[PDB]
From Swiss-Prot, chains A, B:
Organism (species): Rattus norvegicus
UniProt subcellular location: Synapse; Cytoplasmic vesicle, Secretory vesicle, Neuronal dense core vesicle membrane
Free-text comment on this protein's domains from its UniProt entry: The PH domain is essential for regulated exocytosis and binds phospholipids and plasma membrane. It however does not mediate binding to DCVs.
Residues of the full protein shown: 859 to 1025 of 1289
Name this protein carries in UniProt: Calcium-dependent secretion activator 1
Domain MHD1: 64-162
Tissue/organ expression: Specifically expressed in neural and endocrine secretory tissues. Expressed in brain, pancreas, hypothalamus, pituitary and adrenal but not in heart, placenta, lung, liver, skeletal muscle or kidney. In brain, it is absent from the cell body layers of the hippocampus and dentate gyrus but abundant in the synaptic neuropil, except for the stratum lucidum and stratum lacunosum moleculare where it is not detected. In the cerebellum, it is mainly detected in the glomeruli of the granule cell layer where it colocalized with synaptophysin.
Role summary: Calcium-binding protein involved in exocytosis of vesicles filled with neurotransmitters and neuropeptides. Probably acts upstream of fusion in the biogenesis or maintenance of mature secretory vesicles. Regulates catecholamine loading of DCVs. May specifically mediate the Ca(2+)-dependent exocytosis of large dense-core vesicles (DCVs) and other dense-core vesicles by acting as a PtdIns(4,5)P2-binding protein that acts at prefusion step following ATP-dependent priming and participates in DCVs-membrane fusion.
Quaternary structure (record): Interacts with the dopamine receptor DRD2. Interacts with RASL10B. Homodimer.
């Protein structure tokens, strides 16, 4: 009868209830455990979205100090390249800020200033190799090495063909 | 003199100070911005490490209810497979808990129970195809489809050859 179709090893436990019950409990453990992962993911995002917004904003307020220091610059003078190096070397290996609003502004603000320096040193090596056309190399090689060393240390974030 | 080697557009700003200053400021913005990323990463970890520990622990306390429901089981009866399906389908697509302590226990607790069912249905199809040896197929095909449907829905986390 019902009581005997229920008795196992001296205890009244329908083995299809001790399973149907274990199921519903597993259902609840899973749901709590997932809800916990959702909470963690969602808080990560909130704090992230806000800290990136904060970073992009404080970089704007800094930009004005940078844009301003790059007009006090005598034209075709490039002791401002260490600034681009420091700033771009941080932003490019930064998941959050790479190609962000400030990064693109730092590229634009320096994109003419970089080409106006390579065109100026490529014209001073081209003239010096063309100096063998009028009648009457060690120092010249250094300027090739200088331009190559410079270009490699630029780690430019685009693909600049020309 | 010093005052004139300083005057630009009516303001006494050494253009190599308005750069050296912009540099040190960029140094500080970068450091704060990175410190902020470090904080976020580190808190993510703390909360993560603790929520995984919490999950693995509450799965232990559940295991005893599961280990217990799998001895109240009449040998070679498999309405306990929907439990493995629910639990394993969650754990396997869960970055944190996959192949964790509980996941491996759920594999072990069901690894004999799965092979003891395929060997039992592979022996009941092999006998029925071997029934064409004594003198004197539609229903038999269903059991192949049943075993294939079962095996695919198992999504076992190892590579079980045999
Ligand atoms: K977090």
């Amino acid at each position: 009868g019902p009581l005997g179709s229920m008795e196992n090893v001296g205890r009244l436990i329908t083995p299809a209830k001790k399973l149907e019950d274990t199921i519903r409990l597993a259902e609840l453990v899973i749901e709590v455990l997932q809800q916990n992962e959702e909470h963690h993911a969602e808080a990560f995002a909130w704090w992230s979205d806000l800290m990136v917004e904060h970073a992009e904003t404080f970089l704007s307020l800094f930009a004005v100090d940078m844009d301003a220091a790059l007009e006090v610059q005598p034209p075709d003078t490039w002791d401002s390249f260490p600034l681009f190096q420091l700033l771009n070397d941080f932003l490019r290996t930064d998941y959050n800020l790479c190609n962000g609003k400030f990064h693109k502004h730092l590229q634009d603000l320096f994109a003419p200033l970089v080409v106006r320096y390579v065109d100026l040193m490529e014209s001073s090596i081209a003239q010096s190799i063309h100096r063998g056309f009028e009648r009457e190399s060690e120092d010249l090689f250094w300027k090739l090495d200088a331009l190559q060393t410079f270009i490699r240390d630029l780690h430019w974030p685009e693909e600049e063909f020309g």
